[PDB]
């Protein structure tokens, strides 16, 4: 009849609509499942890359601390070398001054030694001359005493006549 | 009745099967959509983290290079500092030796000056004594000559008797 | 005297004889005349009687002839009467037979009329019942056709499921 | 003498007169005697004739009475025959009328029989048709009940769907 055929058409329409819904939903489900699996694989790859990167970061931080210590030591040594160069210059100036002073003092000592030697040679010559003239004076005094006594005796002799 | 009831049963079963499959597919599609959204969010967060890690890696690598620049020169700088320190110690030893030599030279100069003053005073005394001896010798010689001449004149006069 | 007396005696005797004979003859003549007269009278009377007898004889003879005319026909007339009486009795018997046949025919006609009325009433009742059955059969056939068509339409619609 | 002769003449005259009387009387007597004898013979003949005539009269009277009886019987029979002829005519008329009536009644009975036979044949045909349609109505009623129950069951089945 009319109503029975209409109900049958409605039943077939409901069934076909459900089948179309199922087909579309299954297609979209397949697509999203493939997308989810691919995104999980990408996340795993990126996580392994991040682990490697963090390991490299730790290693680089350790190396950086070591190099910081060594570079600070190098800078300390460089400052020390600069100050030692300046100190070398100062000490060389002081040594030049003191060496000039030492040479001047040595020359003055040599001059004083020459003066002392001159005076000592004068002493020796004066002593020689003094001894010689002292002996000569003794001789002449004896001779004069003798001849004066003789002359007085001769005068006393000629006085009586 | 007969195959009419069989037909309505089979049609109802097919319709219910289609509806159930559609509902299950739609529910699973919603679930996988939600899971994919969450996975995308966490993957984006991990990507941001990995980018930050890479930036830190590059910064640390550049710092490591800049620090190696001085860390490699640490030892050569230490050698240069040791050379300059040895030069400084040599200059200091030379200064101390010069100080000692200057002290010794000054001491010897003072001693020689005292010796020269002593010898000069001795020269003065000896010159005074020598002049005194010479004057006395001249006087004694003159007196001896006078007395001898008088005696000889007397003796000569006696011959003409 | 003598022969005179004889003569007178003889003459007287002859005369007396003649007279006596004459008287006797006359007396006998008178007697025979009277007898003849009486005989004539009685003969005339007898003649009258005989004439009357002859007249009566002729009358009776004529009457006898006239009566014989019918007396001879008596027997033939009786035969004719018997024939007519037999015809009458035959007609009477035919009338009685016709009366009996008419009674029987009327009785049978009444019986047949009653039979015909009975059959006519039976025809009326049977026609009423037949029309009732026909109407009911038409109605039942129409309703069966309607229900069968509806069932077939339903079953046809079920095939297109 | 004169007187004697006169007496003799008178005697002879008397004798002759007596003789003449006797002769005449005897002649007349003979005649009348012959007449009387002849009349007696005639009377005897006529008397015998009269006796014969009276005998014939008696015989004729007896015959006449017999013929009277027979002729009266003949006349009675003739009247009877005439009346029987009239009665024959009357009875023939009555028989003709009654025979016409009998034939009319027989024809009416035949017509009534034809009518009754017509009605009886109608009865038989109507009974045949009634039985046929009654069986057909039973069949159709059963079929309609069955198909109506089936249709109601199908409606109840499709109602639940």
Curated annotation (Swiss-Prot), chains A, B, C, D:
The molecule is in a coiled coil structure that is formed by 2 polypeptide chains. The sequence exhibits a prominent seven-residues periodicity. It is found in: Cytoplasm, Cytoskeleton. Residues 40-52 have a biased composition (Basic and acidic residues). Homodimer. It comes from Schizosaccharomyces pombe (strain 972 / ATCC 24843). One of its GO terms (molecular function) is actin lateral binding. Disulfide bonds: none annotated. The lineage of its organism: Eukaryota, Fungi, Dikarya, Ascomycota, Taphrinomycotina. The keyword Repeat applies. Residues 1-161 form a coiled coil. The keyword Coiled coil applies. One of its GO terms (biological process) is mitotic actomyosin contractile ring assembly. Residues 40-65, 107-134 are annotated as: Disordered. Keywords: Coiled coil, Cytoplasm, Cytoskeleton, Repeat. Forms part of the F-actin contractile ring during cytokinesis. This is Tropomyosin. GO terms for cellular component: actin cortical patch; actin filament; actomyosin contractile ring; cell division site; cytoplasm; formin-nucleated actin cable; mating projection actin fusion focus; mating projection tip.
């Amino acid at each position: 009849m009319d109503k029975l055929r209409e109900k049958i058409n409605a039943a077939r329409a409901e069934t076909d609509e459900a089948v179309a819904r199922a087909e579309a939903a299954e297609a979209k489900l397949k697509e999203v499942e493939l997308q989810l699996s691919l995104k999980e694989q990408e996340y795993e790859s990126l996580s392994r890359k991040s682990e490697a990167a963090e390991s490299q970061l730790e290693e680089l931080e350790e190396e950086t601390k070591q190099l910081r210590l060594k570079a600070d030591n190098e800078d300390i040594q460089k400052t020390e070398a600069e100050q030692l160069s300046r100190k070398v210059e100062l000490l060389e100036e002081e040594l030049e001054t003191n060496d000039k002073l030492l040479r001047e003092t040595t020359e003055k000592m040599r001059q004083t030694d020459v003066k002392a030697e001159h005076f000592e040679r004068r002493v020796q010559s004066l002593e020689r001359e003094r001894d010689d003239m002292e002996q000569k004076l003794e001789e002449m005094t004896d001779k004069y005493t003798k001849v004066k006594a003789e002359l007085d005796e001769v005068h006393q002799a000629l006085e009586d006549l």
